Symmetry: C4
Subunit: 244 residues, 4 copies
């Protein structure tokens, strides 16, 4: 719907998705660099990734929904929450933002700590198929947490949606870092991979794992656990971007 | 009650308790595996067990109550909050879930990190009886925090029920790892024990300790501190699953 | 007031303070013991002292107020919030709870980990006067947090009072552990000193500092920053325990 | 507006800014001192700086706004939220408070921990230009978090504004400590520099960085993302402290 697409609100929602992924990728990779004076602990990395998401969802969430992740965007598309063009523009803004975020870190990081710019890397003792099942589970819990925390029909105390979602990213890293350095986000993986021109043969896992994981969470959440009562034409209106 | 059991909503609750226990033990055991490149810190593990519950309570709490622990479900039955059949199906789903969680983790962990699959284990310098009193206290504070945070009659600012409950699991880990590897949940102990075919002689401590501790918190909470004005006919109807 | 002190609600409040200080001291000390398998990091101890208070304030706070500290009790008394008899019984229940918690820990901790049972020891390079001004600042920030977070006239979003209060205890340990092992609570120091029967020549700092620190926060909060429109008779009615 | 300044409410607000900055700087620098018994880990320092802000915004926020940072005060001025004289008196009190807080720490810290009193220090492999871009980004995300969390127009669950803001400070520290020891606040840097009469050649970075970074966040938030429908005349009444 070009009337939804050519709006001021839509322009600033696409911009917020660009800026949030820029910041997220900046803080995340910068925390996991191989700083020689003190090599970062898994705890430090899990916390920086989680607190960045938690802060950006709190600050830019009222502007665009604060997806900051192509897997979550595509899951919301599948789960009939956003339009087709919102998904296209958000994903492209997230990928552009991740590249810019990694590029800014590349420019300010000193040579002795920059290394491979914290690109995701599959553990030598784990296979692509093994790692793919892990990324699916890391992203599934994250998406499920997001959908329950942002659902307007929830009546029980929601607490802090932003911090709940943020600490779900921290949780994902406390296991995921051992398998693939933890991605949960195709853009977070693509970002440094473009700046360093370093795409491993396992790069596909970092896209498929999170997308399948979030899509399975959206199917379970929006269609099996808490479905809404919308007519066939109301569901296509949401895809087209002309709903209410 | 055949009306309570043969309900689509009860089937969703049983599946959610299965799914959340599956995801819980996956992350919990996954975080405490003896990873060669970096041996998990105590703070790291305590935070992973705590945030896994914190996330699952936020996500699947609306579906089933977010029990995820046979000891909490038994305390809720003895505290007259749930039916006998709900308690029965819940414990079953949690046990099967814990097994399924440990097995998925088994299929993905690399050989050099698998080890015991994070089974609970008494400290060599502590006795079975000493472990039991520790497990009772660890699970007593967790159940108290749950009962207080989910009480519909609470007029005090509750904050985040999921994060308080989750950080109460982190608290019990900061003390209980040194004694038994921290259980506070019979399903967390049974899960890896079944998958690895490894049961310690102190395995009973991992069932009795948390169950006694949670039941003592239910009697103190629901019968001594904050009782309801309920008649014999209403109390019996809660057990039979026929109440309102 | 015989009408207030002989009541069932008052009996439950005193018990809650004993039980909360029992659990707080058991968790607090048990996290700081010199465990041979892995000596607890400062961040492990700050988080365990902080999460125990946060969890206990959430669980038992609606029963008694979740004082769990003699210094906070006396600050609420001077600030004209609680009665003189309420303060005496709270302080006595807190002192006995701290002794009981320490004793339960003593009989459960193994011989090689038990040691001095996490008693407050002053740093060999800081004078008693330096440690007292530090304990003044430590408890002052905590008390101000408790007052602002539990004021019923507060219109600003309070978030989670329990977690804010508990994370304040964590902050206090990140500075205070270095100076005195961190007290901010006379009963926390009293507890293990009575079980181990070992009182330092600076134990008075652990009473003077916290009390004076909480007291100055009560004078500043309740009389300078946000005073109430209460007549002199209403003030004595509060101390006597006859007010509303 | 001399009547805005000559008000008991303004007297309490300026005192709160002073006291909050005194406490923030004492706790922050104290957590980063080179304590020989155990040298502080990055995770300890980041948490202490963050939890001091979270705690102080929770307690003194209702009194003055809980700015505690000259870059945030100046950013709110540009964003048309505070008067010119409120900005003047807040900044003045923050610098005075930072010096007092650093000076109090000097008076209580043992000689083996004192060192440089945890002043900011440029990493030798980072240029003043690189570290300036870092300080910009660190403070930019913190300001956006504050503006989105304190906006009275927010319809989405804010959760805990204080904890969200505080954990954004921890987040900034998880990256910035490697570049500059993390400033994000001109008063934080000014305090121990004045007390130790030690001003490195890159002290300007710890002013320009945070100020520009927070000012860009204030321009983006109040003028581009969420502008108010006010008239130029009402806008100058805000600058002059006469509006509502
Ligand atoms: Ni460490």
């Amino acid at each position: 719907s070009k009337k939804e697409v050519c709006s001021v609100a839509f322009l600033k929602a696409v911009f917020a998705e660009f800026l949030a992924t820029l910041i997220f990728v900046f803080f995340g990779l910068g925390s996991a660099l191989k700083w020689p004076s003190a090599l970062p602990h898994i705890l430090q990395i899990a916390l920086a990734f989680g607190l960045a998401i938690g802060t950006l969802a709190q600050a830019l969430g009222p502007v665009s929904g604060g997806h900051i992740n192509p897997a979550i965007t595509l899951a919301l598309l599948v789960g009939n929450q956003i339009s087709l063009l919102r998904a296209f523009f958000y994903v492209a803004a997230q990928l552009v933002g991740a590249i810019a975020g990694a590029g800014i870190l590349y420019g300010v990081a000193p040579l002795n700590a920059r290394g491979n710019l914290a690109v995701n890397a599959l553990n030598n003792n784990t296979t692509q198929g093994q790692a793919m099942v892990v990324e699916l589970i890391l992203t599934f819990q994250l998406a499920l947490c997001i959908f329950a925390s942002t659902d307007s029909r929830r009546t029980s105390p929601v607490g802090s949606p932003a911090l709940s979602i943020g600490l779900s990213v921290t949780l994902g890293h406390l296991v995921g870092i051992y398998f693939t350095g933890c991605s949960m986000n195709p853009a977070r993986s693509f970002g440094p991979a473009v700046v360093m021109n370093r795409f491993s043969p396992a790069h596909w896992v970092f896209w498929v794992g999170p997308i399948v994981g979030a899509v399975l969470a959206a199917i379970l959440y929006f269609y099996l656990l808490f479905p809404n009562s919308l007519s066939l034409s109301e569901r296509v209106a949401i895809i087209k971007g002309t709903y209410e």
